[PDB]
Coordinates of C-alpha atoms in Angstrom, one line a residue:
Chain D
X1 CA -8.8 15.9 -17.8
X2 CA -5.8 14.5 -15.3
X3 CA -7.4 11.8 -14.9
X4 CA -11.1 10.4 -15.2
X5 CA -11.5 9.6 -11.5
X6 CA -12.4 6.0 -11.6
X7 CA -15.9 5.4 -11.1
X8 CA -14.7 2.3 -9.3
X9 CA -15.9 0.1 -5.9
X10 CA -18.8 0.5 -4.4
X11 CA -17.3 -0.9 -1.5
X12 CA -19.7 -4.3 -1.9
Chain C
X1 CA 21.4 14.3 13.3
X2 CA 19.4 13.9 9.9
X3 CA 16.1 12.8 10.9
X4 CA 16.2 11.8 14.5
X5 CA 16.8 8.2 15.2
X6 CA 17.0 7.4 11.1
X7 CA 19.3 5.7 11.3
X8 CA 22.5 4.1 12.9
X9 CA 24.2 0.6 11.7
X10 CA 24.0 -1.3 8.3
X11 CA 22.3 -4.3 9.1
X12 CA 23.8 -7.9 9.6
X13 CA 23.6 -11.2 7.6
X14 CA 20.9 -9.6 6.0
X15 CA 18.2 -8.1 9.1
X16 CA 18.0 -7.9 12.8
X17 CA 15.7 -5.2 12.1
X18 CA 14.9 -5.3 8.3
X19 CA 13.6 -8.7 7.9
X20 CA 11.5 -7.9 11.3
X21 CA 10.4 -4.8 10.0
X22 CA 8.7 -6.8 6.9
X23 CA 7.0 -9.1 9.6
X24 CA 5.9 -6.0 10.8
X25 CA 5.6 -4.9 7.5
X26 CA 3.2 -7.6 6.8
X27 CA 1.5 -7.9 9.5
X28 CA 0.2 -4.4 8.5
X29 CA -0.9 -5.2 4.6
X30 CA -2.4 -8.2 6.1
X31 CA -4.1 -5.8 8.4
X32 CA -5.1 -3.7 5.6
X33 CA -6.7 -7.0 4.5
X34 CA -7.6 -7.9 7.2
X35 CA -11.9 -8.4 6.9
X36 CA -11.7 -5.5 9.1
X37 CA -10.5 -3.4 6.6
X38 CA -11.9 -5.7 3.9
X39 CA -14.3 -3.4 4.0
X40 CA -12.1 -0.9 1.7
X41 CA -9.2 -2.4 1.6
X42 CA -10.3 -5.4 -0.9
X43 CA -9.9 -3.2 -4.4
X44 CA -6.1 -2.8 -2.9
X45 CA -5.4 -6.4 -2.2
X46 CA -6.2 -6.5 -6.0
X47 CA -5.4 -4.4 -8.9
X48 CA -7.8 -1.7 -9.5
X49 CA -10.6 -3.7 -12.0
X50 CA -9.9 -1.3 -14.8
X51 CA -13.2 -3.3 -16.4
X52 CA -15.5 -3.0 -13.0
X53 CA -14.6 0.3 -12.5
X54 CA -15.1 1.5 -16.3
X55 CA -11.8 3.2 -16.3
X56 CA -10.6 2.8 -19.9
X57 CA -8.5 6.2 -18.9
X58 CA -6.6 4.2 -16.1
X59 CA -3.0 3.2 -17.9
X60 CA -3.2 7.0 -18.8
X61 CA -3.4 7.5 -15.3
X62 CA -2.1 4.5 -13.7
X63 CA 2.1 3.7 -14.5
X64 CA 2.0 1.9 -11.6
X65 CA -0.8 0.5 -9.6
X66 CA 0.1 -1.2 -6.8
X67 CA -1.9 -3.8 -5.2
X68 CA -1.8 -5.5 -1.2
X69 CA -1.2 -8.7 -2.4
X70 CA 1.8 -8.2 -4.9
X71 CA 3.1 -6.1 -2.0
X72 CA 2.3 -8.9 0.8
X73 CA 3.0 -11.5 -2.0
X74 CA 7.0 -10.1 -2.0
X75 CA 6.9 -9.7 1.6
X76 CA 6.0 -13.3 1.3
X77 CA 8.4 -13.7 -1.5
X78 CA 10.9 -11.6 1.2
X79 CA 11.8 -10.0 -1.9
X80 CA 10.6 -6.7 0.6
X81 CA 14.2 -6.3 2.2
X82 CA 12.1 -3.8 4.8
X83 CA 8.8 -3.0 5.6
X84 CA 10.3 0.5 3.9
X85 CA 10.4 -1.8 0.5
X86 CA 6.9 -2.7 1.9
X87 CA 5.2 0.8 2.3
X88 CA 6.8 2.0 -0.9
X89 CA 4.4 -0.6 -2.3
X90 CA 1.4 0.4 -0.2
X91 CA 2.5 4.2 -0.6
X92 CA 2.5 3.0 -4.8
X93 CA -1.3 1.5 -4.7
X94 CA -2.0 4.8 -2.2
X95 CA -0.6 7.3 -4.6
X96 CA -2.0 5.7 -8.1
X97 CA -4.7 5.4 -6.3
X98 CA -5.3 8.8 -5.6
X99 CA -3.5 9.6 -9.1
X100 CA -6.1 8.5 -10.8
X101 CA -8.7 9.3 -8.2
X102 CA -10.2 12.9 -7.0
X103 CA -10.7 12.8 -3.4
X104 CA -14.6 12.8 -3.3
X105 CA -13.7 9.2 -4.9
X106 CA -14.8 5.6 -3.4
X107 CA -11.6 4.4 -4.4
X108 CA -9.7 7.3 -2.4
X109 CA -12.6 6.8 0.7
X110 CA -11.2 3.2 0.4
X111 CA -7.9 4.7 -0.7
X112 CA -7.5 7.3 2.9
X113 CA -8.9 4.4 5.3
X114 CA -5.6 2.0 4.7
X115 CA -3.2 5.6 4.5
X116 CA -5.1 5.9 8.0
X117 CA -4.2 2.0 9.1
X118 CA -0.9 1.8 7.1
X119 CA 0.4 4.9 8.1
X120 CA -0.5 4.1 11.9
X121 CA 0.7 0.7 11.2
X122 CA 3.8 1.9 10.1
X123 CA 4.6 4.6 12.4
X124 CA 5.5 1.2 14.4
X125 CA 7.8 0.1 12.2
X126 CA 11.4 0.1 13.3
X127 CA 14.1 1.5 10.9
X128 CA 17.3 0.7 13.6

């Protein structure tokens, strides 16, 4: 576990 | 040589080239939020949402997160000396970006669009 890949923007 | 045409005089009064690049410089992070790039380029003019993205993990990860309007706010704070001051901003938002983000990411799909744009945008930037 680096890093927990964001899960962010959904680009809208 | 070292680098070809990197460099050859210190700059006077303070630009000639420097302050130009950051209007360059600008132009470009404006360009990356520009609606045209608005598209992906939105969760860079801001800090990444560590709340809307559900990171929690993020200041692990993240040291410094750079976002295109910090960046564009010291290019309008000319606290950028260069669009080189400029970049190292976008390149910091870019890298913690992609830090914190595996490259089948949105955020890096957003993330690769502006290194496209930037990057292209800042291949024309002067360094004289």
């Amino acid at each position: 576990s680096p890093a927990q890949g964001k899960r962010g923007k959904k680009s809208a | 040589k070292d680098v070809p045409d990197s460099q050859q005089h210190p700059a006077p009064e303070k630009s000639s080239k420097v302050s130009e690049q950051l209007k360059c410089c600008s132009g470009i992070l404006k360009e990356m939020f520009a609606k045209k790039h608005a598209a992906y380029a939105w969760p860079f003019y801001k800090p990444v949402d560590v709340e809307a993205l559900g990171l929690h993990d993020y200041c692990d990860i993240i040291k410094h997160p750079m976002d295109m309007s910090t960046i564009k706010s010291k290019l309008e704070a000319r606290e950028y000396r260069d669009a080189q001051e400029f970049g190292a901003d976008v390149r910091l938002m870019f890298s913690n970006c992609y830090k914190y983000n595996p490259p089948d990411h949105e955020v890096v799909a957003m993330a690769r669009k502006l290194q496209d744009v930037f990057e292209m945008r800042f291949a024309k930037m002067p360094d004289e």
